Structure formats: structure tokens, C-alpha cells
């Protein structure tokens, strides 16, 4: 089904401007912040669900994610299928590759200790990602075949929660600025 959650959340830091538009549409304007994500998606993620999305507006100038982005319990687990980025490009530990909705993506996990998260401010867990190894051009329709990623992640060893929390196609930032637009279903 079409989106039925909206996720704002910001560190404080600097100025996050976002609008929950009609249909599964959001907007977001930053300036100069610290870390925030902003997103629409569904209160219960799946593995089984195909997102998809068109980002009309993509603009960071700086550190931003252009991403697939949720969580998991039973174990924690953050996780990410970033299609797009500014001026960094996220890493971690390297574990392989996958191929999916035309493009090629790496396949990185990242523990973190006494971290925040959904379960508290000084948590362990681990972020798994799938990071595209080149931008993924935007403005046309475009999918993430997220069971795609689930598989990829199960044959590296990289198992998901079976508690499932949030999953939106988001924009997250980093100490930077920026324009983006983006319509999930």
C-alpha cells in the first residue's frame, strides 16, 4: 500500500525545514545543521516491500543522503539503501556487492557502541548498508527493490531484526545545506 508514516527528526543543530505534502510528496530545506533525517514511508517496515520514489529536487550543498532508511529489533539494526549523496559518500566495513534496480551497490556494515538510537541515547548496534557505487540519477521514477537488499545482506551474514520498526525513503544531512524534494509510494 501507499505511504502511511511521516518521519521529522533533528538534532537541533541549524535550520530543518520540512513540509508532509498531500500523497506520500515531502519537502526539505536546511541550512547549515547538525545530523537530521526527514522521510515519509511506513510505521512498519517489510521485507518484502518494493519502494518507489521520484526526487524531483535533490540539492545538497554538503553532507546529505538521498536513502532508503529504517530499523529493526530483535537484533537492532539501522540500516540503509543510499542511492544518492552531496560531497561524502558513506562507508564502513566492505563485504561485497549487490546488483539491484539497475544499479550496482556496495555492501558495508558499521557497529556502533554507547550510540543513540530508537532504544536509547547510549546503545550498540549494528548499520548495514547498501551504498550505490555511482549517484543514481534523479527526477524519473525510480525503484528500490528492498527484499533485493535483505537477500544480499543474509548471504554476507548480515541478518535483520525480526522486530520492525520505521522504513521511508529519506533525506538525511550532516553539517551542511541544502534543497531536496522527493515522492515516495
Not at 72 to 78: G, H, V, Y
Not at 90 to 100: F, M
Not at 131 to 139: D, E, F, L
Amino acid at each position: 500500500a501507499s505511504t502511511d508514516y511521516w518521519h521529522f527528526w533533528t538534532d537541533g543543530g541549524g535550520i530543518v525545514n520540512a513540509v508532509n505534502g498531500s500523497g506520500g510528496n515531502y519537502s526539505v530545506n536546511w541550512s547549515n545543521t547538525g545530523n537530521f533525517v526527514v522521510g515519509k514511508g511506513w510505521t512498519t517496515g517489510s521485507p518484502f516491500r518494493t519502494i518507489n520514489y521520484n526526487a524531483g529536487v535533490w540539492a545538497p550543498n554538503g553532507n546529505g543522503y538521498l536513502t532508503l532508511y529504517g530499523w529493526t529489533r530483535s537484533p537492532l539494526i539501522e540500516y540503509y539503501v543510499v542511492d544518492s549523496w552531496g560531497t561524502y559518500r558513506p562507508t564502513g566495513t566492505y563485504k561485497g556487492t549487490v546488483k539491484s534496480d539497475g544499479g550496482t551497490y556496495d555492501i558495508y556494515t558499521t557497529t556502533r557502541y554507547n550510540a543513540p538510537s530508537i532504544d536509547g541515547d547510549r546503545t550498540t548496534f549494528t548499520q548495514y548498508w547498501s551504498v550505490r557505487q555511482s549517484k543514481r540519477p534523479t527526477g524519473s521514477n525510480a525503484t528500490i527493490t528492498f527484499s533485493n537488499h535483505v537477500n544480499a545482506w543474509k548471504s554476507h551474514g548480515m541478518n535483520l531484526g525480526s522486530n520492525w520498526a520505521y522504513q521511508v525513503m529519506a533525506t538525511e544531512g550532516y553539517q551542511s545545506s541544502g534543497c531536496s524534494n522527493v515522492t515516495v509510494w
